[PDB]
Design a protein around this ligand. Structure first.
Ligand code: SF4
Lengths: 318, 99, 74, 71, 70, 156, 175, 98, 115, 114
């Protein structure tokens, strides 16, 4: 039955990604004053099903300078790790109650970065090379500030376990003891998610989608589903991490309702941020990241060191 | 040279890092606490040569606390003899989990 | 003036400097000390019968010993 | 009380395993039957094989590896 | 307005309503109506281990209360 | 007749699936490209039909040759066209592309783009309207309704 | 059924890490290296260490990221080498894997392996914790001593890291 | 004896010989130095974990932060090497002769 | 090894996606699709061509501040000790030294070139 | 080298206090209250001698004290103590804060009647 629980985690991620592509296209259409998919049956749904089926038709092809092992083993690591992030997520009681999950979040997100990098390398067509190096750039920028802001926000109340984290999210939301740290965290995760050209330089119009400019049409489903799992993934991690829900004891469905509605409203907020801002810039990303975030983050870190040592508000980190 | 301005200035800024039986962050034992206590109390006011001569037994007792090499030698001998006689078929023992 | 050339830096130095200065003056520091000493993971060991020590009581209900009381007393 | 239950359990495992050894190894030469490995006589802490030897996989995996990656 | 997008949001929300709901329903099904006993530390692990010891089945979730007082 | 019946159902499935999305790429030489951009205008949406821009040549289904195909362009056109998966389709959009058109009697101008690639659908008009181009895409979807590929494969 | 799973993870670790050490192109070297780092994290996590392995996997990963950036930057061939591309790399990979499987044979089906020490060949459920009452997951406090007792040690650590920063800056500046 | 000790020493010796003999790249050399670091790390950590040597468990974290900053120093020097040449093989090292 | 069970199931999911990509749907007629695309022109040599980089300090800077992240991460478990003021002193010294390093290479224009 | 003398299953036949873990952990306050004076003799023996197979007479003593304690708590109020420990058993781990009203019921029961 444990296998049944694993299957009931890896089945709704498929449906989540496909119907979220529907959501992206139609919300973005009504965002940009036009109309979304409407002719295809009831409003869209069977056409995103047809998108998945159509992309499985496409019969992909290997390039010349395209070492087969690295080539077809890159997006496998992408999709598998974009899944296996979802193990310690505390949808009301998580799949595996690990004693720490957030450094695991860090490591598996970095694995998603490496899989993007290896696909952009072994595509071996110079545009995926430029895009892979831009991905290296936005990973140099955004795997430090995210880590130290994480250290700050669980410095206050965390003790590394998500069940104690939902206990700490009880009287007030943790948006209010750390609000500008939350602003910087949301911008950093929006960068790391590699959607939202507010902080995305991989899916360019200057290049053509620097991860997989010329990959193949077959594993585009793998890559596409992996990054939208990344979107839902970090937004659910947001909706656990900062704000939350007063769960009923011995009834989790109300927690699921409040948690899911807050998470998908923040996901619509994320897509609504993607809709309206221009693309951004390599050295400006370095400039903005370091010379705007990093001293203010360190100041928040030392101030959340000094706060529970001066208010006796230290956690019961057993 | 070997300098102990460490010892002279009255600050043990390094020597807490050193051995078990120093006080842990919570007062918890190591695995071989008592054996180090044995070996130091054999070899405290000793000049490291008759320590080699005469505290040799309790030092070997400490080394076999740390590694348990002879105990694993004994247990591996017992398991391999058990496996050869169960491959044999002479008096297959059931006394674990049963009579 | 000196403010908005790169003003997030001034904001960082300000909140960092008050983070340095602020543990000098507080009424809660020794509270933090006594809480963070008075909560053990480990076991309160017994000891030998006594030489009639006028401390260290015989029943845990006996109020001769140093207990924790200021928690429920704010 | 948990200390007492654990002590009765480890004495039970040690008694049963000494008896099983004295039955199964009585024919081989050498092999004193119940010698401590160490030179002195103190209560040596058992090594999770003197407790858990020849228990055929599932019991030893339950005892050792349960807390690590299970639950 | 947004009147023509809400079926997509509702269907995709049920696609995120399902996994925690089925998760907790399976965990309540998986121990005879009791919650899955977590185990953080070694102490609670040994407590759960004597629990699975003193049920006889070597399944801890029965937990045999007040019956073997005598 | 259960074999041909099930194969007929599955062929109808995949042909519906092929005519569902159909995202093109943007080749777009001259003012026919401006008409493509006005086919991306909100008064005539293509994303009612799942029809999305996609600038890579590696995942589009149809390809719109729209503009005045010259000799300096045409080998690059076919070297885009070939590295594209096996269902591939061509929309000849505009009088320049569908037979040469207004620059027909000149050097350095390919007289009709059948001299480089095959063409499924011609849509004349200089430029086409957004409405006429949309009509051409609907007729191409009806061609994808007229496939009977898997019936041919079974009855072979 | 299986019991040697820590030793088997060590075997996979040594296989990938020797194919790492046989020096192909650093792309494939990093692939085998991150495979080895992940399974070594699995080794130390399954052995009893809670966070330290996942931590060092993260750190070591970021190091390999920068190493990949510079091997894209500098060392490129007209066609880079793979394991099965050249004679010498293939020979070294086969011989290292041969020594690995030979050690597997002498551990499994034999008694004793005595190359540098008389290593006791049997399963690593011994030696191990005999169910001691932790209640605080020992290595957590074992790292938490670093800010309690660790006065001098982090002083010299941070001082040497500050010197590392200015050293990299001046060697790059010294043009 | 815990057989993982011998196996990590085997991986140590092979990564050491890989660091010593090497064909042309300085990059592979720095990379395998980083690997041998990781091997010594994991070995020392398993030692401390069997010992319950909980007091000075500063060894893993501090050992590896120092050895990784050594690797940072090496990457800086490799930057200078590839700056003063195109190729960074065993060739274009033969000046400053013994 | 429950995580290993789940990793095995996701790898089987990934392999069935590989096989349903390649083998099942249709055929694979070759002979030009294997060519590398840039924009319509066959480029010189190939890629894996020596490509210089802009940042020189920023990658090593990432490396050293990731190591200092690694030092800073046991701040939650440190926060419960009897020697509170010493913990606060050394922690403030760690972050103050870190910010001194950052602001040093920031005022010595280490980041004002090809970032 | 040296030999050991492990005592057999003769003296180690004391009836195990076979409550499970939840009710046992729930009743820990009052079990500290009524009993748990004479068991510190056993605990002092164990800490000052560090060799079990020596103190186990007081192991029988602590086991009989606990079993007589649960005898006296079964033979009287509370019968809603059944409801109290089955309240504490469901709440994941042993959160002493989620189950409060029945704690007040059981403690006021035992405070009145005993
Ligand atoms: S056919 Fe007409 S509208 Fe199209 S490219 Fe030619 S001149 Fe322009």
């Amino acid at each position: 039955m444990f296998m049944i629980n694993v299957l009931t985690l890896i089945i709704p991620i498929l449906l989540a990604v496909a119907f979220l592509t529907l959501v992206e296209r139609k919300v973005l259409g009504y965002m940009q004053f036009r109309k979304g998919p409407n002719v295809v049956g009831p409003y869209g749904l069977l056409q995103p099903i047809a998108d998945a089926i159509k992309l499985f038709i496409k019969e992909p092809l290997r390039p010349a300078t395209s070492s087969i092992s690295m080539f077809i083993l890159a997006p496998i690591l992408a999709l598998t790790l974009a899944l296996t992030m979802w193990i310690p997520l505390p949808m009301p009681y998580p799949l595996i109650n690990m004693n720490l999950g957030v450094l695991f979040m860090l490591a598996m997100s970095s694995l998603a970065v490496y899989s993007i990098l290896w696909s952009g390398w072994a595509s071996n067509s110079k545009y995926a090379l430029i895009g892979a190096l831009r991905a290296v750039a936005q990973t140099i920028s955004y795997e430090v500030t995210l880590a130290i802001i994480l250290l700050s926000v669980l410095l206050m109340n965390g003790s590394f376990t998500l069940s104690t984290l939902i206990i700490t999210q009880e009287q007030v939301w943790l948006i209010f003891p750390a609000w500008p740290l939350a602003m910087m965290w949301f911008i950093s995760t929006l960068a790391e998610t590699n959607r939202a050209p507010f902080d995305l330089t991989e899916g360019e119009s200057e290049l053509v989608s620097g991860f997989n400019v010329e990959y193949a049409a077959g594993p585009f489903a793998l890559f596409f589903m992996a990054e939208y799992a990344n979107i839902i993934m970090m937004n659910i991690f947001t909706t656990t991490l900062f704000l939350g829900a007063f769960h009923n004891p011995y009834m989790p469905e109300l927690y699921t309702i409040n948690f899911t509605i807050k998470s998908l409203l923040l996901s619509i907020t994320f897509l609504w941020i993607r809709a309206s801002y221009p693309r951004f810039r390599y050295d400006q990303l370095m400039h903005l990241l370091w010379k705007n975030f990093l001293p203010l983050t360190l100041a928040l870190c030392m101030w959340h060191v000094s706060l529970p040592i001066l208010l006796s508000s230290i956690p019961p980190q057993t | 040279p070997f300098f102990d301005v460490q010892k002279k200035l009255g600050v043990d800024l390094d020597h807490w890092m050193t051995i078990q039986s120093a006080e842990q962050p919570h007062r918890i034992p190591a695995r071989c606490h008592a054996f180090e206590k044995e070996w130091i109390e054999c070899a405290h006011g000793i000049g490291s040569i008759r320590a080699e001569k005469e505290c040799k037994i309790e030092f070997e007792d400490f080394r076999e606390c740390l590694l348990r090499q002879k105990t694993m030698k004994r247990l591996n001998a017992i398991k391999r003899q058990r496996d050869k006689l169960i491959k044999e078929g002479k008096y297959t023992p059931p006394p674990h989990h049963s009579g | 003036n000196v403010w908005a050339k790169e003003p997030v830096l001034v904001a960082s130095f300000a909140i960092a400097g008050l983070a340095v200065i602020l543990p000098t003056l507080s009424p809660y520091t020794k509270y933090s000390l006594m809480i963070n000493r008075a909560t053990p993971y480990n076991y309160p060991v017994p000891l030998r019968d006594d030489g009639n020590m006028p401390d260290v009581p015989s029943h845990p209900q006996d109020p001769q010993g140093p207990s924790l009381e200021w928690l429920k007393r704010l | 009380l948990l200390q007492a239950e654990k002590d009765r359990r480890v004495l039970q495992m040690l008694r049963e395993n000494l008896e099983e050894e004295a039955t199964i190894m009585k024919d081989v030469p050498g092999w004193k039957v119940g010698e401590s490995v160490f030179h002195t006589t103190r209560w040596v802490t058992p090594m999770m094989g003197e407790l858990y030897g020849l228990r055929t996989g599932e019991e030893i995996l339950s005892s050792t590896y349960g807390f690590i990656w299970y639950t | 307005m947004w009147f023509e997008v809400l079926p997509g949001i509702a269907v995709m929300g049920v696609c995120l309503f399902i996994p925690g709901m089925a998760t907790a329903r399976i965990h309540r099904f998986s121990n005879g109506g009791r919650e899955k006993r977590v185990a953080h530390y070694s102490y609670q692990w040994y407590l759960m281990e004597r629990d699975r010891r003193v049920s006889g089945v070597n399944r801890y979730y029965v937990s045999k209360g007040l019956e073997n007082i005598d | 007749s259960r074999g041909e019946y099930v194969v007929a159902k599955l062929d109808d499935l995949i042909n519906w699936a092929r005519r569902s999305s159909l995202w093109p790429m943007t080749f777009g030489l001259a003012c026919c490209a401006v008409e493509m951009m006005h086919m991306a205008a909100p008064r005539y949406d293509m994303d009612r039909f799942g029809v999305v821009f996609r600038a890579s040549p590696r995942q589009s289904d149809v390809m719109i040759v729209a503009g005045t195909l010259t000799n300096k362009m045409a080998p690059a056109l076919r070297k885009v066209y070939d590295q594209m998966p096996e269902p591939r389709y061509v929309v000849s959009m505009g009088s320049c592309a569908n037979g040469g058109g207004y620059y027909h009697y000149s050097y350095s101008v390919v007289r009709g783009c059948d001299r480089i690639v095959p063409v499924d659908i011609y849509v004349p008009g200089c430029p086409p309207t957004a409405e006429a181009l949309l009509y051409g895409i609907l007729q191409l979807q009806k061609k994808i309704k007229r496939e009977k590929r898997l019936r041919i494969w079974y009855r072979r | 059924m299986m019991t040697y799973i820590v030793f088997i993870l060590s075997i996979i670790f040594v296989m990938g890490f020797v194919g790492f050490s046989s020096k192909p192109s650093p792309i494939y070297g990093g692939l085998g290296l991150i495979v080895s780092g992940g399974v070594g994290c699995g080794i130390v996590l399954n052995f009893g260490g809670s966070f330290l392995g996942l931590m060092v996997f993260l750190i070591y990963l970021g190091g390999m990221m920068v190493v990949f950036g510079y091997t894209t930057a500098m060392a490129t061939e007209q066609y880079p080498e793979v394991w099965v591309s050249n004679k010498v790399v293939l020979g070294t990979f086969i011989t290292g894997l041969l020594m690995e499987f030979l050690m597997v044979y002498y551990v499994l089906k034999d008694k004793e392996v005595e190359i540098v020490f008389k290593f006791n060949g049997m399963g690593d459920w011994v030696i191990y914790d005999t169910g001691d009452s932790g209640f605080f997951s020992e290595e957590a406090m074992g790292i938490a001593a670093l800010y309690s007792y660790g006065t001098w040690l982090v002083i010299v650590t941070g001082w040497s890291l500050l010197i590392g920063v200015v050293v990299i800056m001046e060697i790059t500046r010294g043009n | 004896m815990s057989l993982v000790y011998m196996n990590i020493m085997m991986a140590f010796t092979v990564s050491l010989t890989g660091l010593l003999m090497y064909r042309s790249h300085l990059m592979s050399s720095l990379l395998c130095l980083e690997g041998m670091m990781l091997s010594l790390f994991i070995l020392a950590t398993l030692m401390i974990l069997n010992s319950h040597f909980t007091l000075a468990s500063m060894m893993p974290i501090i050992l590896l932060v120092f050895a990784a900053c050594e690797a940072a120093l090496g990457l800086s020097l490799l930057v200078m090497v590839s700056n003063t040449y195109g190729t960074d093989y065993v060739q274009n090292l033969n000046l400053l002769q013994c | 090894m429950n995580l290993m069970i789940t990793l095995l199931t996701n790898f089987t999911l990934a392999t069935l996606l590989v096989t349903i990509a390649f083998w099942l749907p249709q055929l694979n007629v070759y002979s030009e699709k294997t060519s590398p695309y840039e924009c319509g022109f066959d480029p010189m040599g190939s890629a894996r061509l020596p490509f210089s980089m802009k940042f020189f300090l920023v990658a090593i800077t990432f490396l050293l501040f990731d190591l200092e992240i690694a030092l800073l991460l046991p701040l939650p478990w440190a926060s419960q000790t009897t020697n509170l003021n010493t913990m606060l002193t050394m922690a403030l010294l760690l972050i103050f030294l870190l910010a001194v390093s950052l602001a040093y290479e920031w005022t010595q224009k280490g980041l004002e070139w090809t970032e | 080298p040296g030999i050991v003398e492990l005592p057999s299953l003769e003296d180690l036949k004391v009836q195990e206090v076979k409550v499970s873990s939840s009710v046992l952990k729930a009743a820990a306050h009052h079990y500290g209250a009524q009993c748990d004076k004479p068991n510190k003799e056993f605990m002092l023996c164990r800490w000052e001698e560090k060799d079990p197979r020596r103190c186990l007479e007081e192991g029988k003593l602590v086991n009989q004290c606990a079993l007589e304690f649960f005898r006296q708590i079964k033979r009287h109020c509370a019968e809603p103590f059944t409801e109290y420990w089955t309240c504490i058993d469901y709440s994941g781990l042993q959160l002493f804060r989620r189950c409060r009203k029945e704690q007040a019921q059981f403690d006021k029961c035992v405070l009145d009647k005993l």
